Every structure is written in structure tokens, then in C-alpha cells.
């Protein structure tokens, strides 16, 4: 499923991401836009044997089990396939653990390269939240 910008914003706000760990909603919407372009089915295979899954491109090496990643840990305790559903609940809850893992939102490279330090409030424009 592909979310509309405000549709995703609402969903994220609903799952408690607005200001979570001090990160405004805009930050999360911006991260999702550049990590997967709002597509829940998005997947990107990495050259290290791991794969990023879902709307927030969560990595299989440490956060979810996809059964084909060497020396992988399953800290979020879920199959990576759950991160590819139309329901972002799984991704949000796992994301909540990642952002608290000691690097802030720097854990998401796309957020770091395209959202960090910008006016992320624009990503919430036109939204009736």
C-alpha cells in the first residue's frame, strides 16, 4: 500500500510518533518519504547480505528475522514480512525501539541525508491532524 502524505501523518500521529523522543511528526513523515516513498512494500537488498523492509526500511541484520541474514539478531521479535503490511503498527513499534538505540533518527540514513536540519514542518502542511 502507498500512503498519501497526510494519511501517513495521521497514522503516525495516531501511533504516538509526534514528538516521540523529541522528534516532531514532520521528521517521521520526511524519513518515510525518503526511505520508501510511503510504500509499505518497499524493500532494498544490501550488499552485506541484509535487507531493509517497509515504510521505514528496517534492517534485517539486527531488527527483524527474514531467515536469510547471517549473524542476524531479532531485537524487535518479528518476521521482516510483518514490516511489509498495510498496517504500520509493527514498523512504528520497532521504529520506537530503534530511535532509542543511541543514535536518534540518525539510524535512518535517508533521514540523515534529506531531513536532518531542514524545515520538516513542511511535510505536515495541509494536514488536518
d(CA 58, CA 44) in angstroms, rounded, equals 10
**Which CATH number belongs to the domain containing residue 70 in this structure?**
1.10.530.10
The number of folded domains in the chain is 1
The one catalytic residue among 7, 35, 66, 119: 35
Q: From residue 50, give the alpha-carbon distance in Å to each of 4, 5, 53, 61, 77.
A: 28, 28, 10, 5, 16
Spatial CB neighbours of 25, under 8 Å, sequence gap ≥ 6: 9, 12, 13, 17, 18, 19, 123, 124, 129
Does 35 participate in catalysis according to the annotation? yes
| Nearest of 43, 39, 24, 46 to residue 115 by alpha carbon | 24
The one catalytic residue among 48, 52, 66, 87: 52
| Nearest of 74, 61, 55 to residue 15 by alpha carbon | 55
Domain range for 95 is 1-129
Does 52 participate in catalysis according to the annotation? yes
Kindly write down the DSSP assignment for every residue of the chain, as one continuous string: -B--HHHHHHHHHHTT-TTBTTB-HHHHHHHHHHHHTTBTT-EEE-TTS-EEETTTTEETTTT-B-S-STT---TT-SBGGGGGSS-THHHHHHHHHHTTTTTGGGGSHHHHHHTTTS-GGGGGTT---
d(CA 84, CA 102) in angstroms, rounded, equals 25
Cα angle for residues 50, 87, 93 (degrees, 5° grid): 65
d(CA 60, CA 98) in angstroms, rounded, equals 12
d(CA 105, CA 67) in angstroms, rounded, equals 26
Q: Name beta bridge partners: 43.
A: 53
Q: Is 66 one of the annotated binding-site residues?
A: no
The experimental technique used to determine this model is X-ray
Judge whether 34 and 110 are in contact, CB under 8 Å: yes
**What nine digits make up the cell of 9?**
501523518
Amino acid at each position: 500500500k502507498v500512503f498519501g502524505r497526510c494519511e501517513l501523518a495521521a497514522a503516525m500521529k495516531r501511533h504516538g510518533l509526534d514528538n516521540y523522543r523529541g522528534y516532531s511528526l514532520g521528521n517521521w513523515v520526511c524519513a518515510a518519504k525518503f526511505e520508501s516513498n510511503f510504500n509499505t512494500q518497499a524493500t532494498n537488498r544490501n550488499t552485506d547480505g541484509s535487507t531493509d523492509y517497509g515504510i521505514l526500511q528496517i534492517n534485517s541484520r539486527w531488527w527483524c528475522n527474514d531467515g536469510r541474514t547471517p549473524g542476524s539478531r531479532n531485537l524487535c521479535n518479528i518476521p521482516c514480512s510483518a514490516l511489509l503490511s498495510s498496517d504500520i503498527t509493527a514498523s512504528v513499534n520497532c521504529a520506537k525501539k530503534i530511535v532509542s538505540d543511541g543514535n536518534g533518527m540518525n539510524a535512518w540514513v535517508a533521514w540523515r541525508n534529506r531531513c536532518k536540519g531542514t524545515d520538516v514542518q513542511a511535510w505536515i502542511r495541509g494536514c488536518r491532524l
